[PDB]
PDB file of C-alpha atoms in Angstrom:
ATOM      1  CA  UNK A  21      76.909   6.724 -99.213  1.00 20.46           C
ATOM      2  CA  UNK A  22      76.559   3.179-101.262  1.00 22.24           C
ATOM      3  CA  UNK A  23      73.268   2.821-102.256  1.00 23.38           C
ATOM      4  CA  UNK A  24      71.870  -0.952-102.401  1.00 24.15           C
ATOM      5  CA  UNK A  25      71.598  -0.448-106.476  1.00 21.98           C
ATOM      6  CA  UNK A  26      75.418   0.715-106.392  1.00 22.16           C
ATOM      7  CA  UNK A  27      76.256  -3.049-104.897  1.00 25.06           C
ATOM      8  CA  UNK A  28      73.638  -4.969-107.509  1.00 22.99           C
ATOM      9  CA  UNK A  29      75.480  -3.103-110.512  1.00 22.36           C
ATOM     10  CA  UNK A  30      79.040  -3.836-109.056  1.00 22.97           C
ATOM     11  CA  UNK A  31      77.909  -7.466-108.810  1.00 22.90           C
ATOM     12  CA  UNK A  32      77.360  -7.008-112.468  1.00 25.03           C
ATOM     13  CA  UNK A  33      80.280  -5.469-113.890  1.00 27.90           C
ATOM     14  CA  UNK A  34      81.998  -8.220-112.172  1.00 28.19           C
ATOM     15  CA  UNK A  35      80.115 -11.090-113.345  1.00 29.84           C
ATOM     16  CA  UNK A  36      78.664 -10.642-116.571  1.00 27.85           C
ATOM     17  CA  UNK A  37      77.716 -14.419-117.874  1.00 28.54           C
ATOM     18  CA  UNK A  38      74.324 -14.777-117.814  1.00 26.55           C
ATOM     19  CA  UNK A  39      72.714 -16.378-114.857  1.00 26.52           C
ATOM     20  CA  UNK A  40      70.869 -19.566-114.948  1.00 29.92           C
ATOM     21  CA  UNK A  41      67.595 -19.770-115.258  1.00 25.23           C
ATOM     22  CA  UNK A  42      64.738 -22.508-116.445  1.00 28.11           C
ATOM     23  CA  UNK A  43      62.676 -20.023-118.080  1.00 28.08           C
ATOM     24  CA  UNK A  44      65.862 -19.362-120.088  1.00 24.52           C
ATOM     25  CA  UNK A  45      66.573 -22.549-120.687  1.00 22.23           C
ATOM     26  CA  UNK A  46      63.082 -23.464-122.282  1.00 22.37           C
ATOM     27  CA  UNK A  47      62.676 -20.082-124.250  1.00 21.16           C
ATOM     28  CA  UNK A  48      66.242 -20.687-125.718  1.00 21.14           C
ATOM     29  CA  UNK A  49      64.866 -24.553-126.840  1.00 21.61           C
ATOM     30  CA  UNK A  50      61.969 -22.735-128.398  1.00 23.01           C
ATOM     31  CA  UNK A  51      63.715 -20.708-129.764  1.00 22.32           C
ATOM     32  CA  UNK A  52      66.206 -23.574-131.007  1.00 21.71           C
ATOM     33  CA  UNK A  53      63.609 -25.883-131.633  1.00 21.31           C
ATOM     34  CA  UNK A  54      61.320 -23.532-134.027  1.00 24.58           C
ATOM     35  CA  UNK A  55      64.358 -22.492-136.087  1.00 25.28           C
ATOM     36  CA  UNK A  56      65.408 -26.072-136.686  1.00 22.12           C
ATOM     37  CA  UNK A  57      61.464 -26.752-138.062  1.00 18.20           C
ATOM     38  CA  UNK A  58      61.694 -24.047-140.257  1.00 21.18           C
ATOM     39  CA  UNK A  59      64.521 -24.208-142.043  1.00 23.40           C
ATOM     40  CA  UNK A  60      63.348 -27.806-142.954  1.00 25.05           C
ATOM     41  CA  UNK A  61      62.282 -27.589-146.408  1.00 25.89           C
ATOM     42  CA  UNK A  62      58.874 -29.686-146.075  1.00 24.59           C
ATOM     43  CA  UNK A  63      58.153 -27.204-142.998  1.00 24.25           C
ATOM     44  CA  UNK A  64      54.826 -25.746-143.766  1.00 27.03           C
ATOM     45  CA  UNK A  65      53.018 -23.067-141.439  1.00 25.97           C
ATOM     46  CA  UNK A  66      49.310 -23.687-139.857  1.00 25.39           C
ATOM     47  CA  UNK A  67      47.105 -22.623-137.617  1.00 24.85           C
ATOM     48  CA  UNK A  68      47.842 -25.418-135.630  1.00 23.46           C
ATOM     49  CA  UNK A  69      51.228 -24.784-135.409  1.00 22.68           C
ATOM     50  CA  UNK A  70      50.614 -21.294-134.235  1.00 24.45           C
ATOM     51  CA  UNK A  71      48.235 -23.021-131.463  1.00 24.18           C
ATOM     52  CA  UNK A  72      51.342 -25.449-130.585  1.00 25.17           C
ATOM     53  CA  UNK A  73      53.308 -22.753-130.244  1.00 26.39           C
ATOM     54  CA  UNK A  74      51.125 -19.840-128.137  1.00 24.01           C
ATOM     55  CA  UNK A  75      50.035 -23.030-125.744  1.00 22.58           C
ATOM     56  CA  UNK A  76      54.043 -24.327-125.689  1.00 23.59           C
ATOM     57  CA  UNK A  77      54.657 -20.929-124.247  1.00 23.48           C
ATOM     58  CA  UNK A  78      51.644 -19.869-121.844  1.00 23.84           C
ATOM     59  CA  UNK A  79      51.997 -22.798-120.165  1.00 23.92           C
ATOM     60  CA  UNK A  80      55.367 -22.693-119.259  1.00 22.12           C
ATOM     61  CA  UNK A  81      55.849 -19.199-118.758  1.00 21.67           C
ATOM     62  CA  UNK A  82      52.562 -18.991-116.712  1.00 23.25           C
ATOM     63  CA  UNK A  83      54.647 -18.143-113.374  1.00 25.95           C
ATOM     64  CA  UNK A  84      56.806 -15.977-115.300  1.00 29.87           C
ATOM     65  CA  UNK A  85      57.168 -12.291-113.489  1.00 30.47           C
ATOM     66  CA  UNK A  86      56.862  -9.469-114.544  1.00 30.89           C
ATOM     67  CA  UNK A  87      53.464 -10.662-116.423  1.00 28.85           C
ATOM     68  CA  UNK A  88      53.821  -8.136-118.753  1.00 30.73           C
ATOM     69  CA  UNK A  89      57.137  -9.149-119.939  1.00 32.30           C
ATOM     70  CA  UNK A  90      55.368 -12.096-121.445  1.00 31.83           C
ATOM     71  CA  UNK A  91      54.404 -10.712-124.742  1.00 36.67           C
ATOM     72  CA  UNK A  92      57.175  -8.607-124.891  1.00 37.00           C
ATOM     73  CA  UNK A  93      59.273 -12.042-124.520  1.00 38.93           C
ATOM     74  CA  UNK A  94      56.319 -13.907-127.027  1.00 40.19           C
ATOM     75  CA  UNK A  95      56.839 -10.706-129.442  1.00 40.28           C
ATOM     76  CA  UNK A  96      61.087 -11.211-129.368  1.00 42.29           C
ATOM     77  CA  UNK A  97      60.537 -14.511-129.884  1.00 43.18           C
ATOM     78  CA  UNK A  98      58.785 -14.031-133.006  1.00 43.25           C
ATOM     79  CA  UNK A  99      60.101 -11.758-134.583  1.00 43.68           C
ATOM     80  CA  UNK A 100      63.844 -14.081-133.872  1.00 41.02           C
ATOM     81  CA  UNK A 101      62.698 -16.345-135.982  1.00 39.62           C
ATOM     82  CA  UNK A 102      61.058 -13.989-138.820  1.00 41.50           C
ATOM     83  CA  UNK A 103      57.649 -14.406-137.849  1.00 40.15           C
ATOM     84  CA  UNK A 104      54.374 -12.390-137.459  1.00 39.56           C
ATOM     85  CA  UNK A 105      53.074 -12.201-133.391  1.00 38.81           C
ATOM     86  CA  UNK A 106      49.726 -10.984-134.044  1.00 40.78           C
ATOM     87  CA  UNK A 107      49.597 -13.952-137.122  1.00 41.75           C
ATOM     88  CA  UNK A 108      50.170 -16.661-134.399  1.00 37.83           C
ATOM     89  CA  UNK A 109      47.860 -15.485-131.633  1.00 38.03           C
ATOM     90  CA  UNK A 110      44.617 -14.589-134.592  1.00 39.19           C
ATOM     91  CA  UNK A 111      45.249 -18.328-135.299  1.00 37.55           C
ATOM     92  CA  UNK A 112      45.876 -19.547-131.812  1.00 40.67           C
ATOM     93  CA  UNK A 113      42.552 -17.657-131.273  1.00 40.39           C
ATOM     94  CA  UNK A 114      41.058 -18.890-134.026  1.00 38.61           C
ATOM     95  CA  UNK A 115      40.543 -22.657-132.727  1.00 34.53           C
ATOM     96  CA  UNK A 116      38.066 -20.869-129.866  1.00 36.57           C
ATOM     97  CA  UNK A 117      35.383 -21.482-132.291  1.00 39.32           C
ATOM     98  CA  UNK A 118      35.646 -25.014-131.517  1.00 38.81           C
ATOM     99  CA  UNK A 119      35.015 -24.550-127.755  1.00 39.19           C
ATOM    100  CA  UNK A 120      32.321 -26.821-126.714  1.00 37.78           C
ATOM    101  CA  UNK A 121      31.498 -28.968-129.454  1.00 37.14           C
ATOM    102  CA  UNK A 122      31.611 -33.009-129.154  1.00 36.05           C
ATOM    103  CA  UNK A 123      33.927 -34.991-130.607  1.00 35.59           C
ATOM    104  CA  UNK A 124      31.405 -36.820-133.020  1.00 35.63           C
ATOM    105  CA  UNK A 125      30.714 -33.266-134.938  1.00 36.79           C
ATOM    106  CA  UNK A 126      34.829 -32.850-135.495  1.00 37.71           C
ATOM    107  CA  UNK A 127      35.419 -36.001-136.905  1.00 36.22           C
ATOM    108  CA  UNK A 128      32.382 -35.768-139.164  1.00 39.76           C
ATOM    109  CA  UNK A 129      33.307 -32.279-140.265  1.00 38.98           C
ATOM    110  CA  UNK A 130      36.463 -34.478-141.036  1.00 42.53           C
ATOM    111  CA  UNK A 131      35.137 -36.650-143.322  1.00 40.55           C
ATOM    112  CA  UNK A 132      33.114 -34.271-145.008  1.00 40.28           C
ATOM    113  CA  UNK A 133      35.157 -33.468-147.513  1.00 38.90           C
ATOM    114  CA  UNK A 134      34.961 -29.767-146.426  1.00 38.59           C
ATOM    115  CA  UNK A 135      35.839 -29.082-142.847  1.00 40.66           C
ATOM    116  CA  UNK A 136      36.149 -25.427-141.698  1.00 42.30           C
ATOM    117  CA  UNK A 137      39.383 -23.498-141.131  1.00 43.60           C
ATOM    118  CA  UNK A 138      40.686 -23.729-138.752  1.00 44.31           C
ATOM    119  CA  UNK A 139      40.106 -27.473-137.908  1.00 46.23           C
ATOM    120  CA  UNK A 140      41.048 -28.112-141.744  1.00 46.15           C
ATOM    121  CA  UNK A 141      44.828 -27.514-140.861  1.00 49.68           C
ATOM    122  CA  UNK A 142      45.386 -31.207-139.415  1.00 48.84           C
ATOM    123  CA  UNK A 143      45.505 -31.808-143.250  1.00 48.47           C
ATOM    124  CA  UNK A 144      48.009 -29.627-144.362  1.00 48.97           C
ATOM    125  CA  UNK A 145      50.577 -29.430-141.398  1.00 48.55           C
ATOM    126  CA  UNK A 146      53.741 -30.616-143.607  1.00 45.28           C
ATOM    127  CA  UNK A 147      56.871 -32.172-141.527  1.00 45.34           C
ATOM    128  CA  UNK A 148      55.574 -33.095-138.513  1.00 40.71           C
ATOM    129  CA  UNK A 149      57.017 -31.529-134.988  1.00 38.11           C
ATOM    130  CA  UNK A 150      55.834 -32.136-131.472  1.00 40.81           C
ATOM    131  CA  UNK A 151      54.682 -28.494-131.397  1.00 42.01           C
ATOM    132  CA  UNK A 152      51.704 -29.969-134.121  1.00 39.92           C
ATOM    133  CA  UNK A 153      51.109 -32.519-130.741  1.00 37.51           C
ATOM    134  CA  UNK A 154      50.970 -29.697-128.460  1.00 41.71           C
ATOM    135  CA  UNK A 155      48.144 -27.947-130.557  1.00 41.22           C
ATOM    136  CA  UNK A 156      46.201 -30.865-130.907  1.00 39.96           C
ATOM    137  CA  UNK A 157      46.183 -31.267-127.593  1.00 39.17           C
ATOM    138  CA  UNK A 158      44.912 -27.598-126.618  1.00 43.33           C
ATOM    139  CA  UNK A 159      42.437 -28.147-129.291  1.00 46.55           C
ATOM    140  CA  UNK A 160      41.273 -31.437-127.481  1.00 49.16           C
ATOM    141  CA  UNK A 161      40.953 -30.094-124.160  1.00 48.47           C
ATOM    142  CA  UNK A 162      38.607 -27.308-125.113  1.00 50.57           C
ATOM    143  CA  UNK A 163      36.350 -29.929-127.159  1.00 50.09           C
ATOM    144  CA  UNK A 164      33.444 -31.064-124.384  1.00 55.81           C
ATOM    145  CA  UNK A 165      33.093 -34.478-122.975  1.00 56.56           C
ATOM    146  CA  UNK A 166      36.335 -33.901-121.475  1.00 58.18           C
ATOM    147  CA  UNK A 167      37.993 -35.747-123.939  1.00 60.23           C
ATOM    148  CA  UNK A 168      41.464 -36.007-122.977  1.00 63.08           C
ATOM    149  CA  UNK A 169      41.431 -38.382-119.787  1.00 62.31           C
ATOM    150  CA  UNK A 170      41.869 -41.494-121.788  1.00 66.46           C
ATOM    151  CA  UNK A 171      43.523 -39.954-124.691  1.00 67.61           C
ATOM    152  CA  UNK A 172      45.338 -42.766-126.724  1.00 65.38           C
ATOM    153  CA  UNK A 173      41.651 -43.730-126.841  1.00 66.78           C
ATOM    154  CA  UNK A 174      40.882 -40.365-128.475  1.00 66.24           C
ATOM    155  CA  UNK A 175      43.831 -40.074-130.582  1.00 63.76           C
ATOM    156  CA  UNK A 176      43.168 -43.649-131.863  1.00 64.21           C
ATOM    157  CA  UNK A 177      39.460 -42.150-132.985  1.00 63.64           C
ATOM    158  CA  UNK A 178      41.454 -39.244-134.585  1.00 63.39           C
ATOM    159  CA  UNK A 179      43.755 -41.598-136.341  1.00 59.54           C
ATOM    160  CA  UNK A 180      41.866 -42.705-139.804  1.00 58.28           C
ATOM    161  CA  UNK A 181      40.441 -39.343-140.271  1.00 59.42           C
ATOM    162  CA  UNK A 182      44.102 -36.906-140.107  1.00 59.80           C
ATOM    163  CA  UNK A 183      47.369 -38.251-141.615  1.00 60.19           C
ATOM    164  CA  UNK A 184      49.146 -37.087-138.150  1.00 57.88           C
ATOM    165  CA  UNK A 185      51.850 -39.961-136.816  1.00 59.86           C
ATOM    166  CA  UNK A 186      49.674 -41.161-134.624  1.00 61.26           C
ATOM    167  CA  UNK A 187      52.207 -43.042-132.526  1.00 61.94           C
ATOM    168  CA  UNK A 188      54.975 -40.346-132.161  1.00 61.49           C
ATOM    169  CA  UNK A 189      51.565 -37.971-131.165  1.00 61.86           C
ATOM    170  CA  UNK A 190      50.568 -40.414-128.059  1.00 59.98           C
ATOM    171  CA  UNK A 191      54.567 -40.406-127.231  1.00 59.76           C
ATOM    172  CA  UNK A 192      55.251 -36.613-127.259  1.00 57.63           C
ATOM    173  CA  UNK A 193      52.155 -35.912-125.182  1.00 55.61           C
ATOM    174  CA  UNK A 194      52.989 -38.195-122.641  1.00 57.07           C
ATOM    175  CA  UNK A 195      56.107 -36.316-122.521  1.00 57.13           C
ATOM    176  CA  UNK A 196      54.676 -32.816-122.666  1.00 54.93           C
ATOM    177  CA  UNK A 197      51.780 -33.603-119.849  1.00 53.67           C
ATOM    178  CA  UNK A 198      54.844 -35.588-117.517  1.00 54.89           C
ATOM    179  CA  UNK A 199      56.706 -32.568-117.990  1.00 56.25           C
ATOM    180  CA  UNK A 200      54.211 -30.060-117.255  1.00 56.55           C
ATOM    181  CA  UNK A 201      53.278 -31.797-113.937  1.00 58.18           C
ATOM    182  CA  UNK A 202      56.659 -31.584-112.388  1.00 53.43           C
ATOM    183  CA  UNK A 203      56.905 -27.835-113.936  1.00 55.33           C
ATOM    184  CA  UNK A 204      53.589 -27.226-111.665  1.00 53.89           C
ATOM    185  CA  UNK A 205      54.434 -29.086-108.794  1.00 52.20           C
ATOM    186  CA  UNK A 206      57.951 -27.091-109.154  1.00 53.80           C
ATOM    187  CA  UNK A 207      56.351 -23.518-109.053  1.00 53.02           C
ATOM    188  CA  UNK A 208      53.947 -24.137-106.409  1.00 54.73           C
ATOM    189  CA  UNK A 209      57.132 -25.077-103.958  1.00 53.69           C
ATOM    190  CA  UNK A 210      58.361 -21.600-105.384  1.00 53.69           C
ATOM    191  CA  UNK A 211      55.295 -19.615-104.797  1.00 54.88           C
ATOM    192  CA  UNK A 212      54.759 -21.111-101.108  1.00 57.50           C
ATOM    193  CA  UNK A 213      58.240 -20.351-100.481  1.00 56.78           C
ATOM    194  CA  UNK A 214      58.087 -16.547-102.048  1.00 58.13           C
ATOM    195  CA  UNK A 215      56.247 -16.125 -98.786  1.00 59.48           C
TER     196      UNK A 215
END
């Protein structure tokens, strides 16, 4: 007697290409995309490349099931491309300290001549990579005044004070927050359908 499992593994053996999938498709450019960084030779790791990178992936993997096969994924991934897991997340999670504060104390601690790690790291990024935009913007979000609803008018405030491009930063997060929109607006149609 057939069993239901005996048809999904016949389906299988018979096709064996991968199937399609958008999660696939933007784990595989991460996976592309952090490899081509890094074998640039003015690539330098920070901690706000690690926050870049951990907020890259929660966010679009946030509908992702099984949840658990998140870090498992998040741990493949890093290890891929020669990299520490626990590293990334310590100084993902490092940038918490900042939760709260107003803008005016970051850019001071800017100037100062002396800011505190992690916040220092918008000095010493290296090449730059849209990833570096991505962290920014986590870090941003988690400052108070809700600072990122006019944020060219932020970023232009951040602009003296960190040698970031502050034009291609503005570009690629009007990209990345288009983008993650339609990814939302996608899922939800998804999870009222999975009904």
């Amino acid at each position: 007697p057939r069993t239901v499992s005996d048809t999904k593994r016949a389906f299988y053996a018979a096709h064996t290409r991968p199937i399609h999938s958008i999660y696939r498709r933007f784990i595989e450019e991460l996976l592309v995309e952090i490899h081509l960084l890094r074998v640039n030779v003015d690539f330098r790791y920070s901690p706000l490349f690690a926050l870049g990178v951990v907020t890259a992936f929660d966010q679009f993997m946030e509908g992702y099931q099984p949840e658990g096969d998140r870090d498992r994924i998040f741990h493949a991934l890093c290890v891929a491309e020669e990299m520490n897991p626990q590293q990334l997340k310590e100084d993902a999670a490092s940038w918490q300290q900042y939760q709260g504060r107003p803008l005016s104390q970051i850019l001071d601690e800017l100037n100062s001549g002396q800011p505190s790690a992690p916040l220092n790291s918008l000095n010493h990024t290296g090449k730059y990579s849209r990833l570096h935009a991505v962290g920014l913007y986590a870090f941003l979000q988690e400052l108070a005044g809700e600072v990122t609803i006019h944020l060219n008018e932020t970023l232009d405030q951040l602009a003296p004070v960190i040698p970031l491009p502050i034009e291609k930063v503005k570009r690629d997060l009007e990209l990345y927050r288009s983008n993650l929109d339609k990814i939302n607006q996608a899922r939800s149609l998804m999870k009222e359908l999975v009904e």
